[PDB]
């Protein structure tokens, strides 16, 4: 909302500052055309420097949601939202997001009415076994890119107000400043749930003078 904040000049915050000077200051008409012009740069610098990485990234290769398989999307969800060190989902609402996705996978690839292989999202507390199980019953979803309808769904779920903001940027659009800046403060206290446990990704609030 344009208010000044004093933060430790980490890579994440330097990216933030840079985007405030070059992208977020632009008028609404100029924001969208500027994002495609810089897209390849932004996606690289989110993945390197920030606490919210580019979602659509498979083994370092910067894809887009439309050019990711259903399996790549379900795995990437686990790698950003489930904590290996403490074998649990950082937030229940993130486990819901990932279960809701996997049900959508079953809907898109089932030929007739069936029973979900995920009867309760409690089963996702073993996320590898749940993914193996779903993508064994629907192996077509290992090979196909996301249906355009399922991309639109996924971004609809990323904007759900009754859940914790997703710890990634899924699309460059008018909504990019909110995906970048929303929910910036928790990471500093939960580095286990940040990409490489990298403090340098995070926003830490601190005074210039009190720092002495």
């Amino acid at each position: 909302m344009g208010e000044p904040i004093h933060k430790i000049a980490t890579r994440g915050v330097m990216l933030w500052k840079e985007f405030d000077e070059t992208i977020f200051n632009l008028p609404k008409n100029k924001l969208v055309p500027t994002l495609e012009a810089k897209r390849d740069y932004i996606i690289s610098r989110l993945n390197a420097d920030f606490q919210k990485p580019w979602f659509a990234t498979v083994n370092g290769q910067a894809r887009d949601l439309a050019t990711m398989t259903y399996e790549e999307v379900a795995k990437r969800l686990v790698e950003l939202m489930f904590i290996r060190s403490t074998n649990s989902w950082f937030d229940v609402t993130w486990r819901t997001f990932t279960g809701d996705f996997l049900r959508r996978v079953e809907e898109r690839f089932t030929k007739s009415k069936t029973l979900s292989l995920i009867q309760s999202y409690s089963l996702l507390d073993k996320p590898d076994e749940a993914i193996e199980k779903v993508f064994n019953a629907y192996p077509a979803a290992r090979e196909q890119f996301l249906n355009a309808q399922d991309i639109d769904h996924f971004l609809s779920m990323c904007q759900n107000p009754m859940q914790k903001p997703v710890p990634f940027v899924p699309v460059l659009d008018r909504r990019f400043e909110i995906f970048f800046k929303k929910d910036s403060l928790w990471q500093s206290e939960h580095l286990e749930a940040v990409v490489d446990q990298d403090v340098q990704r995070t926003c830490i609030l601190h005074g210039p003078v009190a720092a002495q």
């Binding site: 049900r103 079953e106 809907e107 898109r108 690839f109 089932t110 030929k111 007739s112 009415k113 069936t114 029973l115 979900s116 995920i118 009867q119 196909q144 249906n147 309808q149 639109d152 769904h153 609809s156 904007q159």
Partner: protein, 484 residues
């Protein structure tokens, strides 16, 4: 025991969503696809001289080639077919965003905007889809009001008593005076500056009358089909003959079947002079021919360039002007019913000559009042009153090879294939649906009936059998592979 013990018991049902496939050919492992062909075939064929089909599409009475093939092969729509048909016919549209305060992503009824689920598309629409698809009674809304029950004509009559004067502009009245001569009196009205036209006794007049025509049924592109659905702009729709719209959709949809979403991609591999268009028509833009012959004569407002939209080669032009932007061959054939096979033969020879490496082939034709009428006068089409006498429904009026067959059922649409050199298809990694092994045209012989089918194409099987006592080593691929 409360609802707690009966809530963990309660199971979650998954309902299928239509995952429409492009049905690319299924490529086998090399060990298996090496079993069908002889072992000698490897490095025997010049792959620039082999023509393959890398994409195809159509627009016709059962929607696209996907939906038509479902209805041809299985005689019923799958979830995917039923959703595709509902989207084509404009029954359902896609919605992403806020709907009635809740956020909703999926299908909605196009009229009401009520959300529709894919399971419910069959119950809600399939009866409406089957009723307004395929061979069925002629829908006047689809043919500029044309109702074959009430087919408009004009009879010339010599008037026997003077008419009441009517007001007309000066220029209009002058045009009445010129036409009629002394058999009309035009007089200025000083007050208003307009003129009073009085038709006198002996003047020629035209009184509209209606004939009840007997061809009531046709294969018609599903009701609610709309080029705007595929994303063709209004300015293109307002300019071109309806037949052009079937071609533009068939061509983009054939490119998609070839996995070529951007046609300019072809220009990474071939010159702009190596992309042909050999697609043709029998009659071309017959809606534009009606415009220039009939609607102009009746002084209706018809666009000035209607003539260009009539030409059989204008559909291929619009394809090149809106999508392809090639400077390759353009060889528009006119083969009546055999246009599309001639189109392939030209396209094959264009590629084998080296004048192209890729070629859009196919054919297209519209159904309209005047054609329908003239195929009736030639007794080529089935008389629908005789079919109704015999108890036949519209869906059983086209019955080839049958004892009681009594003429053809006129339809409308377009079919397109993309043909390429094999060598370039492999290089580009485009799907390959089949090899065009042969194409040929043939006339018949001396005769006096244009519509009489003859046996000319039998020549494709011509061979000499006088001396066939010992097999020719030319038929033996092992002999040919040795000589190579």
């Amino acid at each position: 025991n409360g609802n707690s013990a009966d809530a963990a018991y309660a199971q979650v049902e998954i309902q299928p969503r239509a995952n429409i496939q492009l049905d690319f050919p299924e490529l086998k492992p090399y060990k298996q696809v090496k079993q069908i062909a002889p072992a000698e075939l490897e490095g025997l064929l010049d792959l620039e001289r082999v023509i393959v089909v890398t994409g195809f599409a159509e627009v016709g009475p059962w929607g696209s080639a996907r939906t038509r093939w479902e209805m041809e092969a299985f005689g019923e729509f799958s979830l995917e077919g039923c959703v595709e048909m509902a989207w084509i016919m404009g029954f359902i549209s896609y919605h992403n965003g806020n709907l009635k305060g809740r956020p909703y992503t999926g299908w909605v009824d196009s009229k009401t905007k009520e959300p529709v689920d894919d399971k419910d598309v069959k119950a809600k629409y399939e009866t409406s889809i089957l009723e307004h698809s395929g061979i069925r009674l002629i829908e006047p809304e689809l043919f500029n009001g044309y109702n074959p029950e009430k087919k408009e004509m004009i009879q010339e009559v010599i008037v026997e008593e003077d008419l009441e004067p009517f007001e007309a502009s000066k220029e209009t009245a002058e045009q009445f005076k010129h036409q009629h001569g002394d058999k009309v009196d035009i007089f200025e009205i000083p007050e208003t500056g307009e003129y009073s036209v009085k038709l006198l006794k002996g003047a020629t007049l035209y009184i509209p009358k209606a004939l009840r025509f007997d061809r009531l049924v046709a294969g018609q592109i599903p009701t609610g089909w709309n080029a705007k659905t595929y994303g063709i702009s209004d300015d293109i729709i307002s300019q071109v003959d309806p037949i052009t719209l079937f071609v533009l959709v068939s061509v983009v949809e054939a490119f998609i079947a070839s996995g070529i979403t951007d046609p300019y991609e072809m220009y990474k591999y071939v010159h702009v002079s190596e992309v042909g268009n050999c697609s043709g028509s029998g009659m071309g833009g017959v809606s534009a021919l009606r415009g220039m012959f009939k609607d102009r004569f009746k002084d209706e407002p018809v666009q000035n360039d209607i003539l260009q939209e009539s030409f059989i080669n204008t559909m291929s032009a619009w394809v090149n002007m809106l999508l392809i932007s090639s400077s390759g061959p353009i060889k528009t054939p006119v083969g009546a019913c055999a246009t599309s096979v001639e189109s392939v033969d030209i396209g094959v020879e264009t590629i084998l000559s080296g004048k192209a490496r890729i070629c859009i082939v196919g054919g297209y034709d519209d159904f309209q009042e005047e054609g329908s009428f003239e195929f009736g006068n030639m007794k080529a089409t089935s008389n629908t009153l005789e079919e109704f006498e015999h108890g036949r429904t519209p869906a059983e009026m086209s019955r080839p090879a049958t004892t009681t067959r009594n003429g053809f059922m006129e339809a409308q649409g377009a079919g397109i294939q993309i043909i390429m050199q094999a060598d370039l298809a492999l290089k580009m990694g485009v799907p390959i649906y089949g090899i065009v092994a042969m194409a040929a045209t043939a006339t018949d012989k001396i005769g006096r009936s244009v519509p009489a089918p003859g046996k000319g194409i039998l020549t494709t099987a011509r061979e000499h059998h006088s001396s066939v006592k010992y097999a020719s080593p030319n038929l033996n691929m092992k002999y040919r592979k040795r000589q190579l």
